[PDB]
Amino acid sequence: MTFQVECVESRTEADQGQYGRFSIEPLARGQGTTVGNALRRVLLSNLEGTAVTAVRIGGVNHEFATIPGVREDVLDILLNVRELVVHAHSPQPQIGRLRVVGPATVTAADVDFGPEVEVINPNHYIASLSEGATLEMELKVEWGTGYRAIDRSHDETTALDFLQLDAVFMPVRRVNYSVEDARVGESTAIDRLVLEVWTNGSLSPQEALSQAASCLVALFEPLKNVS
Amino acid sequence: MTFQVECVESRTEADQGQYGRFSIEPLARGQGTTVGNALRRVLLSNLEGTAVTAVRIGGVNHEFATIPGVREDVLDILLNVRELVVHAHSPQPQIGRLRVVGPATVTAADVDFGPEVEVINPNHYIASLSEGATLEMELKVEWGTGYRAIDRSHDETTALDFLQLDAVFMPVRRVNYSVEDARVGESTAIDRLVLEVWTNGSLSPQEALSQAASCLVALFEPLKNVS
Amino acid sequence: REMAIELFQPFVIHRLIKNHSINNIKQAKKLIQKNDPLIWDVLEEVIEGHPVMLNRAPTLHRLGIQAFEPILVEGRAIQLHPLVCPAFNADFDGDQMAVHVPLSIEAQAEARMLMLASGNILSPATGQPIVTPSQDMVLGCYYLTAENPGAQKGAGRYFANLEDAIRAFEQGSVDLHAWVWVRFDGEVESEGESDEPESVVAADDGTVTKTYRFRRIRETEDGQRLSQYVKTTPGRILFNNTVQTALIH
Amino acid sequence: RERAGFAVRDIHPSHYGRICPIETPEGPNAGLIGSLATHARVNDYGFIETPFWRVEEGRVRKDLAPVYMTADQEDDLRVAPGDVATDDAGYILGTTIPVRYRQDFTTTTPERVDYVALSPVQIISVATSLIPFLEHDDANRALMGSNMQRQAVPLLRPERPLVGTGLEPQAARDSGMVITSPVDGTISYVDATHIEVTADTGEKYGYALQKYQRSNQDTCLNQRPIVFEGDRVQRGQVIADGSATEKGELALGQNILVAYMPWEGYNYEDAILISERLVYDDVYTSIHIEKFEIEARQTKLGPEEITREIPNVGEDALRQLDENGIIRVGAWVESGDILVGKVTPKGESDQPPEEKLLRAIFGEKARDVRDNSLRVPNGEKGRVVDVRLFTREQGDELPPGANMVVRVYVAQKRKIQVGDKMAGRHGNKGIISRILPCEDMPYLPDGTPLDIVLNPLGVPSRMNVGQVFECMLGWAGQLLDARFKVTPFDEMYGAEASRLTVNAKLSEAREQTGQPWVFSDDEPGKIQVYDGRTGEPFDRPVTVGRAYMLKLVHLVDDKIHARSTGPYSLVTQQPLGGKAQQGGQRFGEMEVWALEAYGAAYILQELLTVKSDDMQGRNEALNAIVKGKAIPRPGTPESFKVLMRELQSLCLDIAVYKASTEDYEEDKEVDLMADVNQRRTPSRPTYES
Amino acid sequence: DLLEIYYDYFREQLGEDYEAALESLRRVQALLVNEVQSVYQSQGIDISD
Amino acid sequence: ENVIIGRLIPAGTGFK
Amino acid sequence: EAKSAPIFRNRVIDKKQLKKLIGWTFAHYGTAKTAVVADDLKALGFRYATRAGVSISIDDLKVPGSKAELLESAEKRIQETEDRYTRGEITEVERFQKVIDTWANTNDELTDRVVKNFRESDPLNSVYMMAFSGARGNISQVRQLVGMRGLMANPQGEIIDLPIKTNFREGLTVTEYIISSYGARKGLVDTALRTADSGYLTRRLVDVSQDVIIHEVDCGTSRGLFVEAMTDGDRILIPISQRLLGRVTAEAVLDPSTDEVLAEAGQDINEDLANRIEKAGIKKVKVRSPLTCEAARSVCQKCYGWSLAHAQMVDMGEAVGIIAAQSIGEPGTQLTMRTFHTGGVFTGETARLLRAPVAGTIKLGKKARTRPYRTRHGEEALLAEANFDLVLEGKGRKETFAILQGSTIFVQDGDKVAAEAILAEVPVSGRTKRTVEK
Amino acid sequence: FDLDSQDLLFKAESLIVNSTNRYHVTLQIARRAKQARYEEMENLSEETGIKPVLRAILEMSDELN
RNA sequence: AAAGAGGAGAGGUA
Ligand SMILES: Nc1ccn([C@@H]2O[C@H](COP(=O)(O)OP(=O)(O)OP(=O)(O)O)[C@@H](O)[C@H]2O)c(=O)n1
Ligand SMILES: [Mg+2]
Ligand SMILES: [Zn+2]
């Protein structure tokens, strides 16, 4: 109604993540709790992102699940792949191929993710290789929301060609909010809302806040035409 | 984002309250709670109304006195007239007058407020008078929201021999809601929200829903610009 | 505020005379009695940095008097931190407390450096802790880390870092008492853990996997570890993450 | 008290049925003051009797004029308690009956019994007999509940309990505020101060009612009508009631919704969290009345006068007075307002006599008087409801040496707030720590928010589980509109009587209302509850019911006190003691031990000298603080000098000496009662210039 | 009387009475401390020595 | 004894 | 302040674990981190206590289903005793003692069964959860809630022979309420009448030692005191590691295994050194004590040792007499005013029974010297005069027990003892209580 | 303000740790605070928004470096 | 300029 929004502090972490703090004031006695809770609920579970959904590793023995020449087995590679952050500019899925030979340390910068998909952190550790070893991998990306778990496959799978992974499409990593007194002098009750957002990097906190606010406005708009 | 809202039941109690049930569907997996809790919180605290804030009785100057011929004392009469329900069509305050004589049962039906104020329940019991008794009264009406306590700081004694009252402007009595599964064979986790409103009588449930939706939209709109 | 405006009168008078030049003492006293709004702004900064002493009636040992830093509240009752109640032996069902104010600089220094309530950790009678969580914090920490054969949803999942488990819990995809595997490198103690490797599997290129009741370790040929996974519960992860985070700030 | 032994504070076997074994003070005189039992009576010699029923061959004769017996008459007979169960009020069932013989508990066959007690509650007093489900509690909690039931405040609109015991009407009737119809007639005239009853024959009876009077403890006494005009009444029907009674029954508290669960630390140690509906619905709002007095004496210098012309005061301080100078009825007064204006003609001599003699010779008579009028004390406000004036020439018996007396009455209304004490009838007490808006409290599946939240941690530690029975019965009572009454010691009819009764009532309520969520079979007493801040249900169902709660006379408004500087004592010159006279707090020797154990010497030294009785250091410290400089070093306290003078008065040669630094010179006595610095020493600290 | 017994025995056994007094007092002190600590430990009270 | 006459106690900060 | 990483505690966290964590944090990081750690733990516990929704109900109080048979056996035994007294074979004192012992043993067995049933049936019960997590309750109150109250005591401290066989969930009768009134009166009188003794004692203690202040650094003394563990027979009541913390050694400490030296002369003992000393044997240690200080004042800094509040050596200028006096005098005064928290129940303390695990025959020994004896229950038995060994032989199992001097034996050589039969009893001691007239 | 009480608590703990007697360091802090207050009161105005004891603690902790 | 002085009973709260 008669409030103002300000941005206090912003940083960028080593892993290319982002952090943001916002202050909103003034509001009525109880409006801070409702605004903060609605914003948190919409931010944490109703935003769109990209994630790696299927992988395929070449040169895998079905017993001992161990790659020759690589110090990690299949489980650690699958766990390291799930943390890779991507940002696609098209609604159709794309595929990516990785081929590494010789003694080297594989990194997310060595994945050919087409001409449009981009890799936010090009320093993501994947695996290590020694002399006389090669790594061949295929990755598939998709669109979705939230933490999508898979069936019967916790992590440990070694069988069919394309392995299915449980993915997490969540641009926003953490949200906190607090309500404080902003009376100033002696008068009716007035509060101020402080909101902190940790984002994985593919989005900026201001953009996420704008998207959540737009979603809430679209949700509540068609309810005032009943009278 | 696109859904249907419909009214299922509408009934009236003994000319002193209203009931309404609404169904909203379809929604996402967890948006039913998000919509319902916000609607409940806004409906129960952030609505405007009208109430009686000052009373003047001829022959009485404080609240611990009695009138010869009246079955009740001033405190009971003040408590009775505090819970009178009115609706005003204009933002300016009005003044209502009452005069009753003889053996009678004084109810709310004999208060002349003028064509700018309407009395909801005309069977509100107020007082009883025996043969040789008379009752003369004047009432003041104002706009506000929530609970207002008397302050003895208006040193300007404009309200001479006026007895101030603690004011309660809350036109909504009860709100309830529930969430059901509208999934039909296909596994997609579609929600349906059912909302029930018990209203004081000066407002119909549809108007209260529209006002709450407008307030929520006005709250969440200014966050779409920058952050 | 009613108590504070009376206990700190000379300091308020001095600050009213020095800053916001009034005139003399009589005008300041008239201002205080008339209750001008400015005196509250002056008092809010008069008391900043000035300790106060609190006492309860039966003083059985030296922990019955303690020094605190005051903040102004609206009401007529004193607010007390829950973690200092057992030392005072006080509960909130009718008790009362006494307040004293130091005057000189030496007294203020002694109150800050000898009796401040954040430095009384052990008991003079026996060197045992005295600020342990007492009644509902214990119940909450017990419920958080307990066991529940029922309500096991999302059990068997694999996680990296200690933050992925928390993030998955906040989304409702995992229960609070489920059994999950988490990648953790460090010292771990369990309950009823077997010191003998329950299973040993030796593979090619000189690698061995040893599986215990609550652990799974991968090793090279008589060398260093490569990975370690712990089988635990999300509430225990929350507890340990809170403890670890608190020790770095 | 000092010369009393220890056998007098114990319970004797002869007390049963004559003196209550629970109600007793909890202080230095515990066990020395007692209460008469409910059924006891005193004969014409001064001994206490109790009634019994006689049995013949094994049948209780319940229609044969009960027999009153004394302690020594029943020593040689086998007497059974009041919980023995009979078939049809006739023969005694069972085969082993507990009896009392020769002041000893024994057991016997149901044919040697001689007498049976009338009631199972014959052993307790009136206050202890108002606690339901008392056999499931501890005795100490019963004593605390009986004690706390007598500290409740009458409320604006009282309510009688849903779950009672059956003794409330007699307790209300036997105290003298309930008016009852003495005939079988009709009602002819009703008014807020008068009721008339006309019988069938034709004669009339009239009653007048009290209206807003004062009690010994500044509470309120008020009577209100119950009946209407033209109503048909009977004999013994109630037509009016007092301030703390419902329609014929005692009513001390209110019935409110309660849930047993912890909140976010606001129930930590017996603290209470309540809702805001209890404030704006005028629940737990009370009325208090206070009295102020003033007199006009006649001094040797001249009589004092009650007038309006008060020297050296503004016009805004005399708006509400009238002609004589007495406040008007119906005015609102705050602290510092003038109630009665009194002026004293006094000839003080504290000015040079030249101006006074010149004025006296010249003339121009003016005001040589002083102002000591009556003003309301700090922290008080309210309405003036009564002013009474007594003088001579009116047939009034004034105290000797006085000419006029004025009395003023002031009334106030008080609501519940943070820091007030609340309690129930089962020994559970607490202090309110937070008041919440109703949209933040937990709510039911119906959508109704709760009224109060209590911590369960305190139920098994205090061992008072009757409150759970009471709440679970009150829930069903509210759902059914039934208002049950239960008599204690109800397990003589079965094995699980209370539990089965509560379960049956709850099941009947569930069937009648048609709502399946009000009662559960897996968790009989538990319901699902949602969170008003986020809308998410809690993990497990909690216990919900209706509780009868009271508000006590210990209010935080009469407990907050502070001091900077005030009066001092005449002899020791130490600060006075007491709330009523701006007193200081005592620093006993245990606190001195604690400060010595800490190691803080400067704090202790400043406490002992500058802040208590160093007559010169007080003003130096005050002026140094005001000017922003350092506080000079202290001297010698006055109490040491007083002690030295007192010791010298006993013909003892005690003095302080200074050691000789060098040479043969002997040590020199020091004069402690001498002035060292040429500076003033006034009686009280003051701000110079 | 334990002190007297110790004093007599050690005075006969040793040469001087300084050492005898020291020995007797030491033994009595140890006995008293142990007795008091045991009585306190009978309940649930823990105090340093 | 220093408490009765009002001097610095010989323990703690008043040791010397 | 750093360089130590916390361990991952994969277990349930009760009050003891929290206390251990607080002690570890103080010992490793300092007094400034501990406050923030405690604040964080308090906030987490407060946040997650309300999510659970812990409540109390009538059906939450579970009573074991085997109470009636236990009670019936108790009544049979009591009736046997009363018949024996009526016939004229025992006096009144022996009957009183026998019935008291029988009821005490019955109550002990009942509470053991209650605990076992509560643990086995449902571990998430609210009463169990908030009683056995160390939150507020204790066993003596759950016993009265779901077991049985037992025997009472009157204000003079004597036992009443009529027990209360019901609990609070079932409801008392009139006689049992009358009996409970005595315990209520006992607690009421104890709270305000007996508190003067503790105050008088602490005032005397403060007065006797108000001038003991640290004035000296070292006195140069070789004298000291011998410290060992506190045991009762073969059970250790107080270990030696707890008693050695903060003390200064008066002589060098040598390992009984090798020539290694664990500590030198004039070395304070921290926790790790005390643990090392206890783990490697060592039954006695000589330390510096204030009892043997040679300072010509009160005590020196070297003969005192650590200050327990700060975990390091004392500072010069400390008033230790006041601290000692108010450390001794506080717990008794505090415990006197908490008597009413348990009603007036009698705190049991019975003799130690030796039971035969399996059936067999008794072999006895060769140093066994015994005399005819009459026990306190009115029985004929044998009193031992020297320590010996009892041999119980079975089908394929042979066991030996050690019998000390003064204990009573109920069997002889050659008898055929059945299973779970009493063989010997060690009676309670008379010390730690004051002796009065008969 | 940028200076919270937690930093002062850590600074006081550090001052206590790096000394042999707590009473002596308390007396030193009191003397420094008195001298600083006297210097302020007779000259200039200084950053008066901090009490002299806190100032003395800050300078004494900074001298440790 | 002024303004309370002690004592004795009875009853309560932590
Ligand atoms: N004669 C007395 C009575 C009470 N007290 C003080 O008041 C406390 C009594 O606390 P109270 O609230 O009455 O009982 P608790 O034992 O705390 O139990 P609960 O609060 O659970 O009822 C005692 O511990 C003590 O500090 C005292 O010093 N002397
Ligand atoms: Mg208490
Ligand atoms: Zn020494």
Side-chain angles (χ1 to χ4, degrees), chain B residues 187-223:
Chain B
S187 176
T188 174
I190 281 304
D191 266 8
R192 181 234 319 280
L193 180 67
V194 183
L195 190 95
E196 306 136 66
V197 182
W198 291 264
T199 322
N200 154 67
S202 43
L203 262 191
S204 77
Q206 298 100 235
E207 300 172 47
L209 188 57
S210 293
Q211 293 190 25
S214 311
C215 188
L216 277 163
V217 163
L219 255 180
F220 281 116
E221 182 131 68
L223 290 164

Side-chain angles (χ1 to χ4, degrees), chain C residues 56 89-95, chain D residues 269-270 429 462, chain G residues 136:
Chain C
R56 204 183 153 260
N89 194 71
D91 42 33
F92 314 102
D93 61 11
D95 309 25
Chain D
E269 281 234 84
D270 308 323
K429 39 175 190 131
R462 293 165 150 180
Chain G
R136 191 146 165 177

Side-chain angles (χ1 to χ4, degrees), chain G residues 277-295:
Chain G
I277 288 178
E278 198 211 321
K279 187 176 85 274
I282 297 303
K283 299 225 159 317
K284 294 205 318 296
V285 182
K286 194 162 163 104
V287 291
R288 288 236 222 171
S289 168
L291 288 171
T292 63
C293 197
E294 291 188 347

Side-chain angles (χ1 to χ4, degrees), chain D residues 585-606:
Chain D
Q585 307 289 313
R586 199 190 144 78
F587 213 74
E589 60 175 353
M590 299 198 102
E591 296 99 57
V592 179
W593 300 343
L595 271 193
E596 287 167 348
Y598 257 128
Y602 285 84
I603 300 189
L604 183 58
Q605 206 215 1
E606 152 197 287

Side-chain angles (χ1 to χ4, degrees), chain B residues 41-63:
Chain B
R41 284 197 126 249
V42 169
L43 268 164
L44 275 182
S45 34
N46 294 314
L47 253 51
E48 275 225 321
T50 0
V52 173
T53 62
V55 177
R56 183 233 282 284
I57 309 159
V60 202
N61 40 332
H62 59 292
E63 323 95 49

Side-chain angles (χ1 to χ4, degrees), chain D residues 253-298:
Chain D
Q254 299 253 357
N255 300 286
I256 50 178
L257 248 193
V258 69
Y260 282 94
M261 47 162 318
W263 200 244
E264 293 257 354
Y266 286 105
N267 309 342
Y268 176 51
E269 281 234 84
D270 308 323
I272 296 183
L273 174 92
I274 63 162
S275 176
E276 217 204 350
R277 184 193 85 82
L278 303 193
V279 167
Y280 67 75
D281 260 8
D282 269 330
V283 200
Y284 299 108
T285 300
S286 38
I287 292 184
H288 301 87
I289 306 170
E290 284 98 13
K291 167 182 32 148
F292 305 100
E293 215 192 29
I294 204 192
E295 88 313 355
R297 298 215 100 233
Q298 170 164 248

Side-chain angles (χ1 to χ4, degrees), chain B residues 128-147:
Chain B
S128 324
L129 314 165
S130 56
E131 204 96 16
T134 199
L135 190 52
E136 169 179 34
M137 217 171 340
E138 290 170 39
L139 322 167
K140 197 166 79 104
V141 155
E142 272 177 304
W143 279 85
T145 144
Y147 168 59

